[PDB]
């Protein structure tokens, strides 16, 4: 039965100038630009490394063009530490997304940059 690729990114979040900075690292701990290329059906897993004292948790993954078909589904762990995307790679093209996080300092949601 056919298999795909399972890609991984660690989402490191820290404060600078009082506001979040998102720094992506790969499975080898190396800083990377963060974008992922999909060439066959598979998954992308994002692990939260909250380096702040703001109690960040993923609540989902947001899209200004959510119906573009690039990403099929989002799953999230109960503890807010993981989100995974399902990409069947049946629609060619590019989509941009922003992580959506709750925090324990205030009731505003946190977004990674557009």
């Amino acid at each position: 039965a056919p298999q795909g690729l399972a890609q991984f990114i660690k989402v490191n979040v820290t404060l600078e100038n009082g506001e979040p900075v998102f720094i992506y690292t790969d499975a080898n701990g190396q800083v990377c630009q963060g974008d992922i290329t999909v060439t066959q059906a598979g998954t992308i897993t994002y692990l939260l490394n909250d380096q702040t004292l703001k109690g960040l948790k993923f609540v989902g993954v947001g899209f200004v063009t959510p119906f573009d078909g690039i990403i099929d589904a989002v799953t999230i762990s109960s503890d807010g530490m993981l989100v995974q995307l399902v990409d069947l790679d049946k629609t060619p093209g590019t989509t941009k997304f922003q992580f959506v996080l709750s925090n324990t300092a205030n009731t505003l949601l946190v977004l990674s940059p557009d």
């Binding site: 974008d35 992922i36 999909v38 060439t39 629609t91 060619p92 997304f97 990674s112």
Partner: peptide, 7 residues
């Protein structure tokens, strides 16, 4: 970030 699909 972005996701790039190359089918």
């Amino acid at each position: 970030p972005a996701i790039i699909n190359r089918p």
